Design a protein around this ligand. Structure first.
Ligand SMILES: *[C@@H]1O[C@H](CO)[C@@H](O[C@@H]2O[C@H](CO)[C@@H](O[C@H]3O[C@H](CO)[C@@H](O)[C@H](O)[C@@H]3O)[C@H](O)[C@H]2NC(C)=O)[C@H](O)[C@H]1NC(C)=O
Ligand SMILES: CC(C)CCC[C@@H](C)[C@H]1CC[C@H]2[C@@H]3CC=C4C[C@@H](O)CC[C@]4(C)[C@H]3CC[C@]12C
Ligand SMILES: CC(C)CCC[C@@H](C)[C@H]1CC[C@H]2[C@@H]3CC=C4C[C@@H](O)CC[C@]4(C)[C@H]3CC[C@]12C
Ligand SMILES: CC(=O)N[C@@H]1[C@@H](O)[C@H](O)[C@@H](CO)O[C@H]1O
Ligand SMILES: *[C@@H]1O[C@H](CO)[C@@H](O)[C@H](O)[C@H]1NC(C)=O
Ligand SMILES: *[C@@H]1O[C@H](CO)[C@@H](O)[C@H](O)[C@H]1NC(C)=O
Ligand SMILES: *[C@@H]1O[C@H](CO)[C@@H](O)[C@H](O)[C@H]1NC(C)=O
Ligand code: ALF
Ligand SMILES: [Mg+2]
Lengths: 1165, 369
């Protein structure tokens, strides 16, 4: 790409009016803004599709036999028109892929047809003291209508609130002074807090909308140099007072990415720098590969095995010609050997019928349309059902063993709230969890009782608060508080010390905040609240609900209304939360006797370190500490509050030292940190607040079902490690007795393992694999770890940082050691992971220990592993519309996956596993019959069946039942499969379909064909006249039609017997297929164009010998496999029939078909 | 100033909620099926055996008549006759046979007349079939089967292009003769027509007064004649097949065109055999019951058989509702019933004597570890 040669673009330096070239620079290579998320280019689609389809081995041999079928000089008749099936199958495949790509393109177009506006009306330079107050703005300035299709480097864009970002951006002017804007990078990472972005320091003084076009400068910016958080730009401009050029550098902090969104800013104009693939999301996206199924690889292996069968058969069949051909008898009238082999191989041309891939694609399309039409996956909240985008992948779901998820929108939504707090060791607020499951089977009744109790407590809390007084903005949509004792402890019934403590706790809950209060643009009466952080917004809403409303940000103080009475405080200073400080503090002044008050909110560790442990009562602190420890070990994430009181002189010398140290210049950060440390070394804790994040509906039960079904899942996280840890503890994933094998590279451990990260992680992995459990070794260990295919053991957890995972993934020895560790473990969490890092780790886990994985996720960052997992599923909706671009499937919410992958996967994994043997049985039964017939006439190469059979049989007679068994099979009910997902173990262990199963069916088909030939032949052999009337038979075509009818009825009965769901539908098609066989034979023989037969119906269906031979063939085709299956049922009883017997006995009788996770009130007994 | 359904179909088939019946492989509902199938099909096989041993047949092999016969009645070598008669299972009764030479014909390879005198201890229930059986004569080769043209069947005046340069179904090797006269019967099927003159009557031995006559007409389907029409050629461009010259030293003149419509036997030969053993209908009787006694048949031998080590013979049968007499169907029915019953009993004894609990909710895969 482009790294050097920074692009110099002018601004407010107009070109001469007489000549224009609509640019300031000469022409250069220009990547278009259009985002191509589809598979193939519409202009160049046919060669790509054919080459992808050409990679198989059956279609190529069909093509060569059609080609070489005419190159033979007068060996076989010219085809002429006997080539259209290949044409129709390839064009129908092309049409299906073109429809898929058309859907992708229309989705891209509707994404790119959004709305954008750029100002116009005055003379622009591209497309049509410091500040003075002499020029009056022109009223001609109006916003024009613009589209994302025509945005490119050299353009300015105005963006407002509730709008996305068109491309990589540079902040020029914002709605406020100093050019500070707030952005979510949710598509890039799952951080909760807003991201601050400062604009250019040169344009921090311009205020009015026309002042942004009053200064002339130019921009020197470089192209995408393949980096993630690095950028260097130069803004140069000439002063008017003196003649000189002054420049300002721009680092990554000023750069705004593409997959972001603007919050809390009325208007901001910026400069477009990158366009098209230059965005980071396109770098991390990929190439949207072909997404080719796994089963097709071994299907091609089976096809080439059948080719080897053909070659070995004809290599010994054609050799008999020569011992009789050159010998007696004869009364008819090298190269000859080669032409005999050629005629034999063209005779046996239907060992692999063309219908293979057309049937496969038909089955896949039917499965995709059924998945789409399934109403149990419809997300009525936003009108979007489960949409399978790529229909090629509908069979891989059965082998899903590993689950990879994200935190952006997968596990949880983007909402948090307040539930509990500790005030002087007293708990306030109550929630519902599953933390009492195992401390000492009936847990549903207690859960329902607790839910009812919580609902009643919330209702009565709301009622008491609306009754005791009329709050101005009291609404129940944000009241998450439960405990009612707050009111009577505020009333004064909780003594004096506790009363003061709880009053101050409630006051501090409404003061430490970086939120700005703004009136609602819809209704001034009910003003809205827009905070810099979601937890801060939740805290402010709770403070509003509890009667300590925070309104306004005055110059000296903040408005607080207690219960209705309004008063303005006197704030003195604020120290903002820092990513390294983990504490935010406020200093205010209260007029009595005035007094300064410090209140800081921070992490538990920092709060407990910043305390006064040298004198205390040894009771309050200890009880607060024990409450903190118990919440931590239950799995709550919380903060802590510390206050202090200062006299006038104390406030004065504090502000003096602040102004002399932190208010300075030249890296004031260290001075400010020292001042904060020396002022917070002594503090008095007042209690702690607890934030709680709401997950998706039905996350814990879904995780439990996937864990117990043998699918060990992983979670890959972003923003921070403690966030992931508390999310895991909140969910039913991380247990308290579970050992946390944290893997950090640059933590506080370094003081006793200082070295390079490679050696640090090597020592860590060696001490893990030598001390607790001894399995040190690489090659033998991988050999043993190949052969488990999923087992939950170990009961430990591992936490790894981004740097640690990258340094363990760079090297192959480190990679295999990490793979061994993660296989031993069960709770692999990855944090601070880049898209490239997670793509590399998913590639490694797919390649080593070859296992078919899934990458459910949301955002523009997860595509890197989505496109790697070979199955694509993403969370769609109003929250995410960027991962669904590349994901094969797009769900409404995670709650669907836990059923979809657990039901349909298995379904299809069995359906195809049964269809393949049926398809390779139905052709063997037809071809080996001809092979056996050849032994009489000595492999001369004579048709036994009608010329139309070889083209009409596999297309009409025995095709429908196999397709219907493949598509509308129901192994078990959906409800029973969800209730007992251990059946998925069969897909986990892949024993259902394999080479041994193939060999068994191939031997069965050989036996079937042997019988199907030898029966009518031996019936004839005595007399040639077994027809009840003599009158003329013996013709080859009549014995052929007899044996073909036997074969087709045997295949239909065998399909019916193997079908697990005998309904009025599959049986109806089987009956109609047999009927159409009979009817077509009759109507073809009762016609002028029946050259040979002219009498087939009367010659076949009027003869009791024909019925007798059909019945005995039915007997000998059904009894062998039936009795083998009956014996196997007792020998090695597969779990499927046991669960089916338990289901039919009545165990799962009261359970309705419409299973609901929210109904634990089933009357078992 | 600034400013800034899709419900899926709910049907029974759309949700795959059709009326289903899951099959169950429990012994208590499948053993009765085994028993009923076994008993019903073994008894129908016994009925087939009974209806099969109710017909008699005789085969006489005379492919080597000249080299073994004399001018007088001599006994038939044992390897040339096979009898089955339900009345008498030990009815050997070796018949007699003789050969007479004809000097009027110069085809020394195959000329003369073979006379066979044989006894019959039973009667034919108003249905007699005399057939000619062949062995070691491959009549199913790929080019041999296609060696004919369907266009000539309709009687239209086909050209050399329409019979040699046609599609895969045409008479390739024998389309045209040396001079250039197009064959009306073309190909190997019509060229390999047989030259055994069978009589239209039976020469009785006991009762020479009223000795019975047969009828070879109508031995094919009546409707099938609607496809075969009379020749419509110019009686000058048609020549007999090279192996048909013995019947026409001159060819086809104005008054000798063979009407395919009434020639049932030639049409019957147009149905080439499939296996090594080939036989077609040549004599049928449904007028009167054939009585017992001695009977003599005279056969003209002009078609060569021994030159390719092949064998030919005559086959006389009453017929049956199961066609020709064959015990193979009875054997397979009996063995299928017996093996089904044995399998049912043996699975029952393993299920009872050496059988575990019918169903356990704790014997599944996860229930050991
Ligand atoms: C061609 O026309 C021929 C005259 O109608 C006839 O071919 C054969 O011609 C001879 C000549 O007389 C007929 O007579 C032969 O047979 C009788 C016994 O029926 C002998 O007494 C004669 O001496 C002589 O050998 C034949 O009868 C006659 N063939 C037939 C079948 O009638 C045919 O009409 C035409 N050719 C063919 C092949 O049919
Ligand atoms: C005189 C003997 C040696 C040959 C004549 C007997 C004939 C009828 C028998 C004897 C041996 C038989 C062969 C034995 C082996 C095979 C190979 C098998 O894959 C196809 C059938 C075939 C080809 C048989 C055809 C029929 C056969 C040739
Ligand atoms: C030439 C020899 C060595 C090839 C091997 C043949 C023998 C050992 C193999 C081939 C087919 C096999 C049989 C296939 C089917 C069954 C039915 C099952 O219920 C019992 C085992 C049994 C009976 C197998 C026994 C072993 C077997 C007979
Ligand atoms: C069905 C029928 O009547 N067939 C007769 C046949 O019996 C008779 O020998 C012949 C005499 O030329 O005339 C036919 O029409
Ligand atoms: C013909 O068969 C007779 C009867 O068995 C026999 O005696 C004679 O030798 C045979 N002729 C041969 C073999 O040439
Ligand atoms: C019956 O036998 C006599 C014997 O003289 C024979 O002439 C006659 O042709 C026979 N009957 C028939 C119909 O041939
Ligand atoms: C007797 O046989 C002749 C043979 O042509 C046939 O025409 C006639 O109908 C038969 N008679 C009866 C009563 O079947
Ligand atoms: F959301 Al991430 F690494 F950014 F899991
Ligand atoms: Mg979460």
């Amino acid at each position: 790409n482009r790294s050097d040669e920074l692009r110099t673009v002018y601004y407010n330096l107009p070109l001469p009016e007489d000549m224009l070239d609509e640019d300031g620079l000469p022409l250069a290579v220009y990547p278009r803004n259009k985002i191509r998320t589809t598979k193939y280019t519409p202009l160049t689609f046919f060669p790509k599709n054919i080459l992808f389809q050409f990679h198989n081995f059956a279609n190529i041999y069909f093509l060569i036999l059609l080609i070489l079928g005419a190159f033979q000089i007068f060996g076989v008749t010219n085809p002429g028109f006997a080539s259209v099936p290949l044409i129709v199958i390839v064009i129908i495949t092309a049409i299906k892929d073109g429809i898929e790509d058309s859907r992708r393109t229309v989705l891209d177009l509707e994404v790119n047809n959004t709305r954008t506006h750029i100002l116009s009306g005055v003379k622009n330079e591209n497309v049509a003291n410091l500040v003075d107050r002499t020029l009056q703005p022109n009223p001609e300035c109006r916003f024009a209508k613009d589209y994302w299709k025509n945005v490119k480097v050299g353009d300015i864009v105005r963006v407002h609130n509730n709008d996305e970002i068109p491309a990589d951006m540079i902040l020029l002017s914002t709605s406020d002074v100093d050019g500070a804007c707030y952005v979510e990078t949710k598509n890039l990472d799952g951080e909760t807090n807003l991201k601050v972005r400062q604009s250019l320091k040169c344009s921090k003084i311009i205020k009015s909308s026309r002042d942004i076009t009053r200064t002339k400068f130019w921009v020197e910016s470089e192209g995408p140099h393949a980096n993630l958080y690095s950028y260097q730009g130069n803004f140069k401009w000439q002063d008017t007072q003196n003649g000189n050029i002054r420049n300002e550098p721009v680092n990554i902090n000023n750069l705004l990415l593409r997959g972001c969104t603007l919050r809390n800013t009325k208007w901001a104009m910026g400069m477009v720098i990158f366009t098209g693939d230059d965005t980071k999301i396109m770098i991390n996206a990929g190439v949207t590969p072909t997404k080719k199924s796994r089963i097709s690889r071994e299907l091609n292996f089976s096809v080439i095995l059948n080719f080897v069968l053909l070659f070995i058969l004809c290599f010994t069949a054609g050799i008999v010609n020569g011992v009789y051909y050159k010998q007696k008898p004869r009364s008819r009238d090298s190269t000859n050997g080669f032409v005999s082999f050629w005629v034999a191989v063209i005779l046996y041309q239907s060992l692999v019928p063309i219908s293979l891939y057309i049937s496969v694609e038909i089955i896949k399309t039917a499965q995709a349309i059924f998945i789409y039409t399934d109403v149990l996956l419809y997300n009525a909240k936003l009108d979007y059902p489960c949409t399978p985008k790529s229909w090629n992948i509908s069979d891989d779901l059965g082998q899903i063993e590993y689950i990879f998820s994200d935190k952006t929108g997968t596990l949880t939504q983007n909402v948090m709230e307040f539930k509990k707090c500790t005030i002087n060791g007293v708990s306030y607020g109550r929630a519902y969890t599953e933390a009492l499951a195992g401390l000492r089977v009936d847990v549903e009744s207690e859960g329902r009782r607790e839910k009812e109790e919580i609902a009643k407590d919330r209702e009565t809390m709301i009622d008491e608060l609306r009754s005791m007084s009329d709050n101005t903005q009291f609404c129940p949509e944000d009241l998450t508080f439960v405990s009612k004792e707050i009111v009577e402890d505020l009333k004064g019934s909780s003594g004096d010390h506790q009363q003061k403590c709880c009053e101050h706790f409630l006051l501090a809950l409404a003061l430490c905040h970086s939120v700005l209060v703004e009136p609602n643009k819809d209704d001034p009466k009910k003003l809205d609240i827009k905070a810099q952080s979601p937890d801060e917004s939740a805290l402010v809403s709770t403070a509003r609900q509890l009667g300590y409303s925070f309104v306004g940000s005055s110059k000296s103080g903040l408005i607080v209304e207690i219960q209705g009475v309004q008063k303005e405080f006197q704030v003195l200073n604020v120290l903002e939360f820092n990513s390294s400080r983990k504490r935010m503090s406020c200093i205010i002044k209260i007029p009595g006797e005035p007094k300064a008050l410090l209140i800081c909110k921070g992490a538990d560790s920092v709060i407990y370190s910043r305390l006064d442990r040298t004198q205390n009562d040894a009771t309050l602190l200890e009880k607060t500490a024990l409450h903190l420890e118990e919440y931590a070990t239950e799995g709550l994430r919380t903060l802590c509050l510390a206050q202090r009181e200062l006299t006038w002189s104390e406030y004065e010398r504090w502000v003096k030292t602040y102004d002399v140290a932190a208010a300075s210049v030249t890296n004031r950060e260290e001075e400010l940190d020292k001042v904060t440390d020396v002022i917070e070394r002594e503090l008095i804790l007042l209690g702690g607040t607890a934030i709680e994040d709401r997950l998706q509906d039905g996350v814990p039960d879904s995780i439990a079902l996937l864990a117990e079904a043998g699918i060990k899942l992983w979670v890959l996280t972003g923003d921070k490690v403690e966030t992931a840890i508390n999310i895991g503890f909140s969910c039913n994933v991380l247990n308290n007795d579970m050992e946390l094998l944290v893997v950090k590279a640059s933590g506080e451990d370094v003081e006793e393992f200082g070295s390079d990260p490679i050696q640090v992680v090597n020592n860590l992995v060696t001490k893990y694999l030598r001390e607790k459990f001894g399995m040190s070794g690489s090659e033998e260990e991988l050999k043993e770890a190949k052969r488990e295919h999923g087992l939950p053991q170990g009961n430990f957890a591992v936490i790894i940082d981004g740097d640690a995972l990258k340094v363990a993934l760079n090297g192959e020895e480190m990679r295999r050691k990490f793979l061994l560790l993660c296989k031993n473990c069960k709770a692999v969490l990855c944090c601070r992971v880049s898209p490239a890092q997670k793509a590399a780790v998913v590639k490694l886990v797919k390649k080593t220990l070859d296992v078919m994985t899934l990458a459910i996720g949301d955002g523009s960052n997860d595509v890197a592993m989505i496109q790697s997992a070979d199955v694509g599923v993403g969370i769609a909706g109003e929250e995410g519309r960027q991962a669904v671009m590349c994901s094969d499937y797009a769900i409404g919410q995670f709650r669907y996956v836990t059923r979809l992958v657990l039901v349909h996967g298995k379904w299809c994994y069995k359906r195809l596993a049964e269809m393949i043997p049926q398809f390779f049985y139905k052709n063997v039964i037809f071809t080996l019959s001809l092979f056996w017939y050849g032994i009489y006439n000595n492999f001369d190469g004579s048709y036994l069946f009608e010329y139309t059979y070889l083209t009409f049989y596999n297309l009409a007679f025995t095709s429908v039942p196999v397709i219907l068994l493949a598509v509308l099979d129901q192994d078990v009910s959906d409800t029973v499969s969800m209730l007992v997902p251990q059946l998925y173990r069969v897909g986990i262990l892949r024993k259902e379909w394999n080479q041994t199963k193939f060999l068994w069916y191939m031997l069965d088909g050989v036996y079937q064909s042997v019988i199907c030939f030898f029966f009518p032949y031996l019936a004839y052999h005595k007399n040639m006249v077994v027809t009840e009337n003599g009158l003329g038979l013996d013709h080859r075509y009549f014995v052929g039609v007899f044996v073909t009818a036997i074969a087709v009825t045997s295949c239909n009965f065998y399909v019916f017997m193997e079908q697990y769901r005998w309904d009025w539908f599959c049986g109806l098609f089987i009956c109609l297929s047999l009927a159409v066989f009979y009817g077509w034979t009759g109507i073809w023989t009762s016609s002028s164009s029946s050259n040979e037969f002219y009498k087939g119906a009367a010659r076949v269906f009027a003869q009791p010998a024909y019925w007798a031979v059909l019945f005995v063939g039915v007997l000998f085709c059904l009894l062998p496999r039936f009795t083998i299956d009956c014996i196997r049922k007792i020998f090695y009883p597969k779990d499927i029939e046991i669960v089916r017997e338990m289901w039919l006995r009545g165990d799962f009788d009261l359970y309705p078909q419409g299973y609901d996770p929210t109904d634990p009130s089933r009357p078992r007994i | 100033d600034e400013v800034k359904n899709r419900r899926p179909k709910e049907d029974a088939f759309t949700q795959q909620r059709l009326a289903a019946i899951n099959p169950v492989l429990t012994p208590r509902t499948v053993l009765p099926l085994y028993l009923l199938i076994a008993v019903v099909f073994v008894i129908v096989g016994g009925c087939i055996l009974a209806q099969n041993s109710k017909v008699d047949e005789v085969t006489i092999y005379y492919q080597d008549c000249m080299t073994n016969a004399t001018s007088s009645w001599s006994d038939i070598p044992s390897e040339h006759w096979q009898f089955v008669f339900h009345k008498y299972k030990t009815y050997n009764t070796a018949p007699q046979w003789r050969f007479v030479d004809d000097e009027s014909d110069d085809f020394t390879k195959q000329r003369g007349t073979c006379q066979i005198r044989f006894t019959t201890p039973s009667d034919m229930k108003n249905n007699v079939y005399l057939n000619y059986v062949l062995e070691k004569f491959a009549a199913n080769h790929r080019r041999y089967v296609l060696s004919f043209s369907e266009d000539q069947i309709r009687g239209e005046d086909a050209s050399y292009e329409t019979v040699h340069d046609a599609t895969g179904i045409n008479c390739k090797p024998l389309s045209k003769n040396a001079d250039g006269k197009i064959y009306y019967p073309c190909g190997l099927i019509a060229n390999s027509m047989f030259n055994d003159t069978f009589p239209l009557q039976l020469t009785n031995v006991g009762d020479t007064s009223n000795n019975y006559s047969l009828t070879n007409k109508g031995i094919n389907w009546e409707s099938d004649k609607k496809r075969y029409k009379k020749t419509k050629y110019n009686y000058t461009q048609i020549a007999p097949p090279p192996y048909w010259e013995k019947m026409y030293p001159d060819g086809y003149n104005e008054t000798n065109i063979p009407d395919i419509q009434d020639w049932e036997e030639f049409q019957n030969w147009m149905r080439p055999g499939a296996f090594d053993k080939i036989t077609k209908l040549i004599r049928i009787n449904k007028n009167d019951t054939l009585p017992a006694g001695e009977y003599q048949l005279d056969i003209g031998l002009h078609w060569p058989v021994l030159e390719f080590n092949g064998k030919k013979g005559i086959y006389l049968t009453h017929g049956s509702h199961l066609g020709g007499r064959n015990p193979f169907l009875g054997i397979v029915y009996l063995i299928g019933g017996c093996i089904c019953a044995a399998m049912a009993l043996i699975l029952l004894t393993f299920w009872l004597f050496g059988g575990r609990k019918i169903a356990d909710a704790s014997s599944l895969s996860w229930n050991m570890k």
